[PDB]
Design a protein around this ligand. Structure first.
Ligand SMILES: [Ca+2]
Ligand SMILES: [Ca+2]
Ligand SMILES: [Cl-]
Length: 401
């Protein structure tokens, strides 16, 4: 499906695609290129816990194409500014990184991981990722003007900021195209309403408008600790819908096609609190698993991975356990073992990857939402090889096409 940026998954992956694995480890940045040779390559002696002083609680580390050549660069929101290591095209990156803007940082603009959100996104159809932050006064953007030149930060909209009452412990903020013009709009699950703000394509967003009185902490009792929510295309028209894992199960509100939204319906009595799903034990994702290229539901539960396939119209088929692994009963832990649903094979049907206690493992989609056997990738980038979730960042990312 289509480009959505969320707090949980700030580095989108392509469908179809052959995603790479990237690790910000103790010693710097390491990649596992998706290829016939599976190996770890150290590419930058920076952006690491010891190699550079990078901290999850102070800094943000992402991958984004900042030049327009469809190669992803490493972008870090560091201590005193934004630092970028560009992709050299050959599984190497520039080192040291370049400081492109003294803003959006812990000691340049007072940015705080616990109050603010920092993304990279092509907001103006230039082919290059601009810097986008949900800061104190609103949403701020720094335009990527090319050749590493980022312009001084401009206020894009005086909303969705900490000053307006937006809180990471209560609310959710996304970027997603809800209108179909290819521009990423803001979607914010506020106190009482889901709000959208249309991207005008010029570095600003239009005034926020409420679309749904549900999916929020004050409207339906949706909490961060218990009820995950996503935005995703559930019908194939490339416009994002709203999906939440609530108490009884999965609730949706479908986009009418113009950024207006339908009623909230319970579409599947599974994957919710009443079926025993718990944010601290389980992982719940929406990704395309089939040739319909719509959002299907994937849950890493107790006994393994469970999937319900979208019929193509936002209704769902039966829940099936597709692999007896990657689950809580197999020792997988949200606090220790990152798990992703991403295309690793290029067929457009997302696959599973997880960074286990000892090894990285994958399980490949057969093409129809059913899965093959578990496969070992490599014995690195794991707990026992010195990667603790709290001192490292790991992503699936398309470094190259
Ligand atoms: Ca749009
Ligand atoms: Ca695949
Ligand atoms: Cl710095």
């Amino acid at each position: 499906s289509v480009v959505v940026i969320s707090q949980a998954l700030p580095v989108p992956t392509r469908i179809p695609g052959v995603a790479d694995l990237v690790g910000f480890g103790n010693g710097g940045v390491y990649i596992i290129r998706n290829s016939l040779l599976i190996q770890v390559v150290k590419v930058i002696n920076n952006f690491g816990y010891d190699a550079g002083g990078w901290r999850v609680e102070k800094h943000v580390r992402l991958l984004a194409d900042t030049t327009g050549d469809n190669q992803s660069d490493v972008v870090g929101f560091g201590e005193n500014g934004v630092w970028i290591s560009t992709n050299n095209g050959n599984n190497t990156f520039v080192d040291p990184p370049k400081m492109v803007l003294a803003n959006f940082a812990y000691a340049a603009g007072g940015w705080r991981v616990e109050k603010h959100i920092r993304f990279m996104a092509d907001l103006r159809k230039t082919g290059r990722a601009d810097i986008v932050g949900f800061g104190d006064g609103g949403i701020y953007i720094s335009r990527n003007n090319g050749g590493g030149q980022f312009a001084p930060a401009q206020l894009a909209l005086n909303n969705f900021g900490y000053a307006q009452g937006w809180r990471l412990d209560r609310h959710l903020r996304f970027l997603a195209d809800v209108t179909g013009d290819g521009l990423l709009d803001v979607v914010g699950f506020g106190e009482n309403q889901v709000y959208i703000a249309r991207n005008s394509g010029n570095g600003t967003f239009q005034p926020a408008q409420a679309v749904v009185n549900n999916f929020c902490i004050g409207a339906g009792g949706w909490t961060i600790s218990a009820h995950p929510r996503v935005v995703a295309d559930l019908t194939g028209d490339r416009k994002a819908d709203i999906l939440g894992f609530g108490v009884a199960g999965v609730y949706t509100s479908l986009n009418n096609g113009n950024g207006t939204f339908g009623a909230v319906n319970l579409v599947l009595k599974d994957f919710g609190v009443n079926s025993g799903w718990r944010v601290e034990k389980h992982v719940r994702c929406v990704s395309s698993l089939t040739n319909k290229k719509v959002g299907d539901i994937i849950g890493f539960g107790d006994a393994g991975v469970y999937v319900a396939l979208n019929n193509g119209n936002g209704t769902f088929g039966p829940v099936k356990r597709v692999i007896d692994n990657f689950g809580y009963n197999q020792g997988w832990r949200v606090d220790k073992h990152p798990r992703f649903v991403v295309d690793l094979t290029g067929d457009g049907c997302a696959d599973i990857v997880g960074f286990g206690e000892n090894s990285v493992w994958a399980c490949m989609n057969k093409g129809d939402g059913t899965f093959g056997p578990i496969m070992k990738l490599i014995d690195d980038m794991t707990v026992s090889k010195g990667w603790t979730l709290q001192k490292t960042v790991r992503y699936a990312a398309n470094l190259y096409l």
